[PDB]
Design a protein around this ligand. Structure first.
Ligand SMILES: O=C(CO)[C@@H](O)[C@H](O)[C@H](O)COP(=O)(O)O
Length: 242
Protein backbone atom coordinates (compact mmCIF):
# COMPACT_ATOMS: atom_id res chain seq x y z
CA UNK A 1 0.00 0.00 0.00
CA UNK A 2 1.35 3.50 -0.91
CA UNK A 3 0.32 6.12 1.64
CA UNK A 4 0.60 9.78 0.62
CA UNK A 5 -0.05 12.52 3.23
CA UNK A 6 -1.57 15.61 1.61
CA UNK A 7 -1.32 19.08 3.14
CA UNK A 8 -4.92 19.97 2.39
CA UNK A 9 -8.17 18.56 1.00
CA UNK A 10 -7.54 20.63 -2.13
CA UNK A 11 -4.16 18.92 -2.67
CA UNK A 12 -5.73 15.48 -2.07
CA UNK A 13 -8.33 16.33 -4.66
CA UNK A 14 -5.74 17.55 -7.19
CA UNK A 15 -3.67 14.39 -6.85
CA UNK A 16 -6.74 12.14 -7.03
CA UNK A 17 -8.01 13.86 -10.14
CA UNK A 18 -4.59 13.54 -11.75
CA UNK A 19 -4.37 9.79 -11.01
CA UNK A 20 -7.88 9.29 -12.39
CA UNK A 21 -7.03 11.38 -15.47
CA UNK A 22 -3.92 9.25 -15.98
CA UNK A 23 -6.13 6.13 -16.07
CA UNK A 24 -8.46 7.73 -18.59
CA UNK A 25 -5.72 8.88 -20.92
CA UNK A 26 -3.61 5.71 -20.84
CA UNK A 27 -6.79 3.72 -21.68
CA UNK A 28 -9.56 5.90 -23.22
CA UNK A 29 -11.92 2.93 -22.89
CA UNK A 30 -11.06 2.57 -19.21
CA UNK A 31 -13.60 1.32 -16.76
CA UNK A 32 -13.60 3.60 -13.72
CA UNK A 33 -15.01 2.51 -10.39
CA UNK A 34 -16.45 5.57 -8.67
CA UNK A 35 -17.61 6.65 -5.22
CA UNK A 36 -20.03 9.17 -3.74
CA UNK A 37 -20.01 11.00 -0.40
CA UNK A 38 -18.22 14.11 0.76
CA UNK A 39 -14.70 12.88 0.25
CA UNK A 40 -14.51 12.74 -3.59
CA UNK A 41 -16.39 16.02 -4.17
CA UNK A 42 -13.17 17.96 -4.82
CA UNK A 43 -11.87 15.21 -7.11
CA UNK A 44 -14.90 15.48 -9.34
CA UNK A 45 -14.61 19.26 -9.39
CA UNK A 46 -10.96 19.02 -10.41
CA UNK A 47 -11.69 16.37 -13.09
CA UNK A 48 -14.22 18.71 -14.61
CA UNK A 49 -11.65 21.49 -14.50
CA UNK A 50 -9.14 19.32 -16.38
CA UNK A 51 -11.86 18.79 -18.99
CA UNK A 52 -11.39 22.54 -19.64
CA UNK A 53 -7.78 23.32 -18.82
CA UNK A 54 -6.37 20.17 -20.51
CA UNK A 55 -9.09 19.29 -22.96
CA UNK A 56 -9.39 15.97 -21.15
CA UNK A 57 -12.00 13.76 -22.89
CA UNK A 58 -14.31 11.22 -21.28
CA UNK A 59 -15.82 10.04 -24.58
CA UNK A 60 -14.89 6.38 -24.36
CA UNK A 61 -14.98 5.79 -20.62
CA UNK A 62 -17.25 3.42 -18.79
CA UNK A 63 -18.04 3.82 -15.09
CA UNK A 64 -19.40 1.62 -12.32
CA UNK A 65 -20.40 3.01 -8.94
CA UNK A 66 -19.91 1.30 -5.59
CA UNK A 67 -23.35 1.67 -4.18
CA UNK A 68 -26.91 3.00 -4.10
CA UNK A 69 -29.47 3.34 -1.36
CA UNK A 70 -32.36 0.84 -1.37
CA UNK A 71 -35.75 2.30 -2.10
CA UNK A 72 -34.62 5.51 -3.79
CA UNK A 73 -35.33 6.29 -7.45
CA UNK A 74 -32.76 7.90 -9.72
CA UNK A 75 -34.44 11.29 -9.61
CA UNK A 76 -34.50 11.36 -5.73
CA UNK A 77 -32.05 14.08 -4.65
CA UNK A 78 -30.52 11.71 -2.08
CA UNK A 79 -29.84 8.92 -4.55
CA UNK A 80 -26.35 8.23 -5.71
CA UNK A 81 -27.65 8.30 -9.28
CA UNK A 82 -28.55 11.95 -8.67
CA UNK A 83 -25.24 12.68 -7.00
CA UNK A 84 -23.20 11.26 -9.89
CA UNK A 85 -25.22 13.09 -12.51
CA UNK A 86 -25.08 16.38 -10.64
CA UNK A 87 -21.41 16.28 -9.60
CA UNK A 88 -19.93 14.60 -12.67
CA UNK A 89 -21.86 13.19 -15.59
CA UNK A 90 -23.67 16.40 -16.53
CA UNK A 91 -20.35 18.22 -16.90
CA UNK A 92 -18.37 15.80 -19.10
CA UNK A 93 -18.45 14.45 -22.69
CA UNK A 94 -19.06 10.82 -21.80
CA UNK A 95 -21.61 8.46 -23.35
CA UNK A 96 -24.38 8.50 -20.72
CA UNK A 97 -25.41 4.88 -21.30
CA UNK A 98 -21.94 3.77 -20.18
CA UNK A 99 -22.42 5.00 -16.59
CA UNK A 100 -23.66 2.17 -14.39
CA UNK A 101 -25.01 2.39 -10.84
CA UNK A 102 -27.07 -0.23 -8.95
CA UNK A 103 -30.81 0.33 -9.23
CA UNK A 104 -31.98 0.77 -5.63
CA UNK A 105 -35.57 1.00 -6.86
CA UNK A 106 -35.62 -2.45 -8.54
CA UNK A 107 -38.45 -4.80 -7.57
CA UNK A 108 -36.05 -7.61 -6.72
CA UNK A 109 -32.94 -6.16 -5.13
CA UNK A 110 -31.18 -9.53 -4.86
CA UNK A 111 -31.57 -10.08 -8.59
CA UNK A 112 -30.39 -6.53 -9.27
CA UNK A 113 -27.22 -7.24 -7.30
CA UNK A 114 -26.54 -10.45 -9.26
CA UNK A 115 -27.01 -8.63 -12.58
CA UNK A 116 -24.78 -5.79 -11.43
CA UNK A 117 -21.96 -8.13 -10.47
CA UNK A 118 -22.34 -9.88 -13.83
CA UNK A 119 -22.12 -6.52 -15.58
CA UNK A 120 -18.95 -5.53 -13.76
CA UNK A 121 -17.39 -8.87 -14.81
CA UNK A 122 -18.45 -8.40 -18.40
CA UNK A 123 -16.81 -4.98 -18.51
CA UNK A 124 -13.48 -6.56 -17.71
CA UNK A 125 -13.51 -5.43 -14.06
CA UNK A 126 -12.37 -1.86 -13.21
CA UNK A 127 -9.11 -0.20 -14.31
CA UNK A 128 -9.20 1.98 -11.20
CA UNK A 129 -11.56 1.95 -8.21
CA UNK A 130 -12.02 5.11 -6.16
CA UNK A 131 -12.99 4.49 -2.52
CA UNK A 132 -13.72 6.41 0.60
CA UNK A 133 -13.69 4.97 4.14
CA UNK A 134 -16.38 4.88 6.74
CA UNK A 135 -15.78 6.04 10.25
CA UNK A 136 -15.90 2.31 11.07
CA UNK A 137 -13.63 1.22 8.22
CA UNK A 138 -16.33 0.30 5.74
CA UNK A 139 -15.55 0.36 2.03
CA UNK A 140 -18.52 0.72 -0.22
CA UNK A 141 -21.28 -0.22 2.23
CA UNK A 142 -19.45 -3.37 3.30
CA UNK A 143 -19.83 -2.97 7.04
CA UNK A 144 -17.77 -4.69 9.73
CA UNK A 145 -18.19 -8.42 9.59
CA UNK A 146 -18.48 -8.65 5.83
CA UNK A 147 -16.61 -11.50 4.18
CA UNK A 148 -13.64 -10.54 2.03
CA UNK A 149 -15.19 -12.89 -0.58
CA UNK A 150 -18.39 -10.83 -0.74
CA UNK A 151 -19.87 -9.82 -4.08
CA UNK A 152 -22.47 -7.15 -4.91
CA UNK A 153 -25.23 -7.50 -2.30
CA UNK A 154 -28.03 -5.97 -0.26
CA UNK A 155 -26.90 -4.66 3.13
CA UNK A 156 -28.48 -3.26 6.24
CA UNK A 157 -26.58 -0.10 7.07
CA UNK A 158 -24.98 0.17 10.48
CA UNK A 159 -26.31 2.90 12.74
CA UNK A 160 -22.94 4.71 12.58
CA UNK A 161 -23.32 4.97 8.80
CA UNK A 162 -26.85 6.36 9.09
CA UNK A 163 -25.63 8.81 11.77
CA UNK A 164 -22.76 9.95 9.51
CA UNK A 165 -24.87 10.39 6.41
CA UNK A 166 -27.81 12.10 8.16
CA UNK A 167 -26.22 15.48 7.29
CA UNK A 168 -27.39 14.99 3.72
CA UNK A 169 -31.06 14.22 4.47
CA UNK A 170 -34.01 16.36 5.49
CA UNK A 171 -34.43 14.36 8.69
CA UNK A 172 -33.07 11.30 10.47
CA UNK A 173 -36.27 9.43 9.58
CA UNK A 174 -35.53 9.79 5.84
CA UNK A 175 -32.13 8.14 6.00
CA UNK A 176 -32.46 4.72 4.32
CA UNK A 177 -31.93 1.53 6.29
CA UNK A 178 -30.57 -0.56 3.42
CA UNK A 179 -28.35 -0.29 0.39
CA UNK A 180 -26.91 -2.16 -2.58
CA UNK A 181 -23.09 -2.32 -2.65
CA UNK A 182 -20.26 -3.85 -4.62
CA UNK A 183 -18.68 -6.45 -2.38
CA UNK A 184 -15.18 -6.60 -1.05
CA UNK A 185 -14.14 -9.12 -3.69
CA UNK A 186 -15.76 -6.92 -6.35
CA UNK A 187 -13.55 -4.04 -5.14
CA UNK A 188 -10.39 -6.18 -4.83
CA UNK A 189 -10.75 -7.29 -8.47
CA UNK A 190 -9.89 -3.77 -9.60
CA UNK A 191 -6.54 -3.34 -11.27
CA UNK A 192 -5.79 -0.28 -9.10
CA UNK A 193 -7.33 1.16 -5.94
CA UNK A 194 -7.34 4.83 -4.94
CA UNK A 195 -8.56 5.34 -1.35
CA UNK A 196 -9.28 8.94 -0.33
CA UNK A 197 -9.44 9.98 3.33
CA UNK A 198 -10.13 13.47 4.63
CA UNK A 199 -10.95 15.10 7.93
CA UNK A 200 -10.85 14.46 11.68
CA UNK A 201 -13.84 12.11 11.56
CA UNK A 202 -11.65 9.53 9.82
CA UNK A 203 -8.55 9.79 12.02
CA UNK A 204 -9.41 6.67 14.05
CA UNK A 205 -10.05 4.68 10.85
CA UNK A 206 -6.72 5.86 9.44
CA UNK A 207 -4.96 4.65 12.59
CA UNK A 208 -6.55 1.21 12.32
CA UNK A 209 -5.78 0.97 8.59
CA UNK A 210 -2.13 1.88 9.11
CA UNK A 211 -1.69 -0.49 12.13
CA UNK A 212 -2.16 -3.30 9.58
CA UNK A 213 -4.29 -5.86 11.42
CA UNK A 214 -6.19 -7.73 8.71
CA UNK A 215 -9.72 -8.72 9.69
CA UNK A 216 -13.37 -8.58 8.76
CA UNK A 217 -14.04 -6.32 11.74
CA UNK A 218 -12.31 -3.50 9.77
CA UNK A 219 -13.34 -3.87 6.10
CA UNK A 220 -10.74 -1.51 4.64
CA UNK A 221 -8.04 -3.86 5.98
CA UNK A 222 -8.81 -6.09 3.00
CA UNK A 223 -6.83 -3.55 0.99
CA UNK A 224 -3.60 -4.87 2.55
CA UNK A 225 -4.17 -7.87 0.28
CA UNK A 226 -4.16 -5.86 -2.97
CA UNK A 227 -1.09 -5.20 -5.12
CA UNK A 228 -1.77 -1.62 -6.20
CA UNK A 229 -3.39 0.56 -3.54
CA UNK A 230 -2.75 4.27 -3.13
CA UNK A 231 -4.14 5.99 -0.03
CA UNK A 232 -4.37 9.78 0.06
CA UNK A 233 -4.79 11.18 3.58
CA UNK A 234 -5.07 14.84 4.51
CA UNK A 235 -3.49 16.32 7.67
CA UNK A 236 -6.64 16.15 9.73
CA UNK A 237 -7.23 12.51 8.82
CA UNK A 238 -3.58 11.67 9.64
CA UNK A 239 -3.68 13.16 13.14
CA UNK A 240 -3.92 9.87 15.09
CA UNK A 241 -1.65 7.72 12.97
CA UNK A 242 0.49 5.16 14.88
O1 LIG B 1 -19.24 3.64 -0.77
C1 LIG B 1 -19.05 4.76 -0.34
C2 LIG B 1 -18.97 5.87 -1.37
O2 LIG B 1 -19.60 5.49 -2.62
C3 LIG B 1 -18.85 4.93 1.17
O3 LIG B 1 -17.98 3.91 1.62
C4 LIG B 1 -18.18 6.26 1.56
O4 LIG B 1 -16.93 6.34 0.88
C5 LIG B 1 -17.95 6.42 3.05
O5 LIG B 1 -19.14 6.22 3.79
C6 LIG B 1 -17.33 7.77 3.39
O6 LIG B 1 -18.29 8.80 3.08
P1 LIG B 1 -17.82 10.32 3.10
O7 LIG B 1 -17.10 10.51 4.41
O8 LIG B 1 -16.88 10.51 1.94
O9 LIG B 1 -19.06 11.15 2.96
Amino acid sequence: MKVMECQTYEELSQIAARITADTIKEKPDAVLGLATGGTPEGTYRQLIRLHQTENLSFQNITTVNLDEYAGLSSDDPNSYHFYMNDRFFQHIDSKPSRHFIPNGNADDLEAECRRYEQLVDSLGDTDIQLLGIGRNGHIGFNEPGTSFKSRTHVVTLNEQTRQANARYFPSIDSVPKKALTMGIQTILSSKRILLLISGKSKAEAVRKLLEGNISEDFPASALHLHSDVTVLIDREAASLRP
